[PDB]
């Protein structure tokens, strides 16, 4: 069984741990069993074949900047996560995460993931975002970011509805194989 190292990066509170727990345990986010441990694995059937996918769940806050790259050696594919209803995490794709990954890993395939798809259409989320004079990230803008940073894929998903969730990790594996 071929193991693949995939490293997930992004600002705190964009949903990354939730996505990874939900996906790798095959549970809806509301029913996830809490764990005190970090990182996750899963066996994915990709194009007919089962592969092992090791998922590194990294802390995105500034107090962790200097040590986090020690996780980058031996990575096959990166996920750079932002939240579709958090414009500020979307800007940090370009201000922080894209430069950090390449400043360390010049040729590793990047997949840009927009998380929390379900809340882009959420009225309360819209109305709370409108209160700060912000607005959800559209699919065109995520694609435009995907182009500026040279990601091999642009992907939108929602742990709650499961939409686009299978696809993110299928593509993570297809960018390597």
């Amino acid at each position: 069984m071929q193991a693949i190292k995939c490293v997930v990066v992004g600002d705190g509170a964009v949903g990354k741990t939730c996505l990874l727990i939900s996906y790798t345990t095959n549970a809806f986010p509301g029913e996830y069993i809490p764990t005190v441990f970090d990182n996750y694995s899963a066996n994915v059937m990709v194009d007919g074949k089962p592969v092992n996918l090791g998922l590194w769940d990294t802390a995105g806050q500034e107090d962790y900047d200097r040590l986090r790259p020690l996780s980058y050696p031996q990575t096959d594919v990166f996920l750079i996560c932002f939240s579709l209803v958090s414009p500020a995490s979307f800007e940090n794709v370009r201000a922080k995460w894209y430069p950090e990954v390449r400043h360390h890993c010049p040729n590793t395939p990047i997949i840009l993931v927009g998380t929390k798809l379900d809340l882009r259409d959420d009225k309360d989320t819209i109305e709370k975002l409108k209160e700060k004079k912000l607005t959800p990230i559209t699919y065109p803008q995520g694609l435009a970011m995907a182009k500026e940073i040279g990601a091999v894929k642009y992907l939108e998903c929602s742990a709650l509805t499961q939409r686009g969730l299978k696809t993110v990790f299928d593509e993570a594996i297809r960018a390597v194989l």
């Binding site: 345990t25 092992n52 990294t58 040590l67 031996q74």
Partner: protein, 276 residues
């Protein structure tokens, strides 16, 4: 394959299936979104897409909670369940895949009503469902005809999670050919947690002497012993990773050894034992 619990609730919608509960047998490595969407589609075609809803909560459904204007399909991933007497007689993976009629899933809950809490408040139910016929079967699904459940209190969850981590790390270290990427993923997620609470979160919630005594001494005794084994199994996996790493992972390995050594220091102070 992969097995799923599906339960139907929809008084003005279902007929034979109304009130019933099944284990669906799906193709190998099928995920939760693939069966949920199919079921959603399949019954949205009978009742109309606007009238069909998934129930994600895995606790037993109380029909009083459901809008009579909707049919509902509860879907939950389950795994084949065997007790320790069954796990010895069953030999191959084909023996875990054959003649099975019991299936287990887990539900998070706290005694305040919240589903989720910190380690000192978080409990866990284990529900074992039993089907009327053994798998493999001519049909894709088999009706569940009984269920049984046990629950774990927070320190029993702490004991359970730490004990399995020991066995996991122990297993990694003694496999003939070690997958390095798998070993480091579980090593770094043991001695170097930064997102989740960390294994020391159990030690601080249950083993500290400046907490109000709340759990039987024999259980506190046993969690301590398990933590001694955990600290052991971290040091062994660490050393195995020493031999395997190439020059690109010298600084990452030394960073993992420094987090390990802080963890053992903190554990030493809580347990008033010098740990490794």
């Amino acid at each position: 394959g992969r097995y799923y619990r599906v339960a139907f609730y929809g008084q003005g919608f279902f007929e034979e299936e109304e009130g019933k509960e099944y284990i669906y047998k799906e193709p190998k490595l099928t995920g939760l979104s693939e069966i949920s969407q199919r079921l959603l589609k399949l019954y949205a075609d009978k009742f109309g897409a606007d009238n069909v809803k998934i129930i994600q909560d895995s606790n037993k459904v109380n029909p009083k909670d459901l809008d009579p204007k909707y049919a509902y399909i509860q879907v939950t991933y389950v795994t084949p369940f065997f007790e320790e007497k069954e796990i010895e007689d069953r030999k191959t993976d084909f023996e875990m895949h054959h003649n099975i009629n019991r299936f287990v899933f887990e539900t998070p809950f706290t005694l305040s009503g919240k589903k989720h809490g910190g380690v000192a408040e978080q409990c866990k139910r284990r529900t074992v469902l039993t089907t009327s016929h053994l798998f493999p079967y001519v049909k894709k699904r088999i009706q569940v005809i009984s269920q049984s459940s046990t629950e774990l209190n927070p320190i029993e969850v702490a004991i359970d999670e730490m004990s399995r981590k020991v066995s996991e790390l122990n297993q990694l270290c003694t496999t003939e050919e070690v997958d390095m990427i798998r070993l480091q993923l579980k090593l770094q997620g043991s001695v170097s947690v930064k997102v989740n609470a960390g294994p020391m979160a159990y030690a601080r919630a249950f083993l500290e002497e400046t907490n109000a005594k709340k759990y039987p001494d024999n259980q506190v005794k046993l969690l301590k012993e398990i933590f001694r084994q955990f600290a052991d199994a971290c040091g062994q996996a660490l050393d195995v990773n020493e031999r395997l790493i190439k020059e690109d992972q010298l600084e990452y390995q030394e960073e993992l050894r420094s987090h390990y050594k802080d963890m053992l220091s903190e554990l030493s102070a809580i347990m008033n034992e010098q740990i490794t």
